[PDB]
Design a protein around this ligand. Structure first.
Ligand SMILES: [Ca+2]
Ligand SMILES: [Ca+2]
Ligand SMILES: [Ca+2]
Lengths: 236, 207
């Protein structure tokens, strides 16, 4: 007879953007999460003497902005990355108070990330001379009158398929930009057109490839490529 | 029945195992020749520095991206360039603005890149190798071009777009364009040196 209210279900709606990462990175960036609103649905009603539940009304409380409270839990680029042919995107669950959330359709709410090997211009999970050539070739094309980042594709990958405006070409640019003059101030969210992909990027990459191919650096390239990148870019 | 090994060289070349493995139908069939220097006497050879050329033919305007391993008899002494590199690019790579020699013990890894198929025929690389003072008549110091591969990366000889024909050319290069245990030299000096997987040499005529 006594009427009460209780949460019936709870879901989040999230506005997020893509994020690009290297396989060696230890942290996803929560800046991908632009806005997250938590909805809580209530039922109000009673249980009759016959033990049957009666619902008198259904409603939500005021939705709550929880954008700032969302984390990616324990997931990291390094522990998520798997080399798979023609496949670079991952759905990373968000966490709120150390638990996943459901989206409006009952599925765990996730954010899209792309993770690859630095230097891997052609997106084949291998860093080699072909990547250096592709990077050089893109520089030469975009250095020609009448051509730029908008009309030239960088990656030979079928995922780009010659399409200058593919998101995978932005991802390829991120992977190829091994020499960034601006440093950390040019963020991972820069688009291909916002980067400088030049012969210096191409010659690093080639040198990474050559050093990886001799006894001295074979293991460094395979185990901690980041230490080899620093050597080849003059940063260490 | 007995197993024979070279005096001071190992066979690091691996089986070319990328698809396609058979380069017989390749429109472009590149072949790499390596210097075969022969001295008449030990005195003629002892302490001499020899220019060893690695020369490609049959691939003019048909390649862009290369990378292969060179090794030499450990008794030879490499004479580095002014930059410390063990190898120096040649005229075949003049139109390839990416070119890099990486030192590797008794050997070097040599690679190139180009923004189009600007690879040319001719000398790709030179290495200067000095004959030891204690060289004797009959001695052979083999010089090897080898294909290597691992799951992280492998050696290359392909065109700018790494096309189907580029990959056929690559298979041809490594399986027929160079010597290896699967395509052995029949050169008498290399047979004598027990190094028929090798490609060139500095040899001293028998007494
Ligand atoms: Ca690659
Ligand atoms: Ca750059
Ligand atoms: Ca060989």
């Amino acid at each position: 007879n006594t009427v009460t209210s209780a949460v019936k279900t709870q879901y989040v709606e999230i506005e997020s953007v893509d994020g690009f990462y290297f396989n060696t990175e230890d942290k996803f960036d929560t800046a991908q999460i632009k806005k997250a609103v938590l909805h809580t649905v209530y039922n109000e009603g009673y249980t009759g003497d016959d033990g049957v539940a009666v619902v008198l009304r259904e409603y939500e409380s005021e939705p709550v902005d929880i954008t700032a409270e969302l984390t990616f839990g324990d997931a990291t680029p390094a522990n998520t990355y798997k080399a798979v042919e023609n496949k670079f995107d991952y759905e990373i669950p968000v966490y709120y108070n150390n638990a996943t959330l459901k989206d409006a359709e009952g599925n765990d709410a996730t954010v899209t990330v792309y993770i690859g090997l630095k230097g891997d211009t052609d997106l084949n999970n291998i860093v080699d001379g072909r990547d250096a050539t592709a990077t050089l070739t893109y520089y030469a094309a975009t250095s020609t009158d009448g051509k730029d980042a908008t009309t030239v594709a960088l990656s030979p990958s079928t995922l780009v398929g010659g399409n200058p405006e593919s998101v995978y070409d932005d991802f390829s640019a991120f992977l190829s930009d091994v020499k960034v003059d601006a440093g950390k101030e040019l963020t991972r969210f820069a688009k291909k057109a916002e980067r400088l992909i030049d012969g210096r990027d191409a010659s690093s990459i080639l040198t990474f490839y050559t050093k990886s191919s001799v006894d001295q650096y074979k293991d460094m390239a395979a185990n901690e490529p980041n230490k080899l990148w620093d050597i080849v870019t003059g940063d260490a | 029945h007995h197993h024979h090994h070279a005096m001071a060289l190992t066979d690091r070349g691996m089986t070319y195992d990328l698809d396609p493995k058979d380069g017989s139908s390749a429109a472009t069939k590149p072949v790499l020749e390596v210097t075969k220097k022969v001295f008449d006497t030990a005195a003629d050879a002892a302490g001499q520095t020899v220019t060893v050329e690695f020369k490609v033919s049959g691939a003019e305007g048909k390649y862009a991206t290369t990378g292969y391993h060179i090794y030499w008899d450990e008794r030879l002494e490499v004479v580095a360039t002014k930059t410390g590199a063990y190898a120096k690019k040649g005229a075949a790579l003049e139109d390839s603005s990416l070119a890099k020699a990486e030192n590797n013990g008794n050997g070097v890894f040599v690679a190139s890149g180009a923004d189009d198929d600007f690879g040319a025929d001719g000398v790709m690389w030179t290495v200067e190798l000095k004959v030891p003072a204690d060289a004797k008549a009959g001695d052979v110091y083999p010089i090897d071009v080898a294909y290597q591969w691992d799951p992280s990366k492998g050696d290359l000889f392909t065109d700018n777009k790494d096309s189907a024909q580029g990959k056929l050319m690559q298979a041809y290069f490594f399986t027929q364009g160079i010597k290896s245990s699967s395509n052995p030299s029949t050169d008498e000096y290399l047979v004598k040196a027990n190094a028929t997987y090798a490609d060139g040499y500095i040899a001293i005529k028998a007494g």
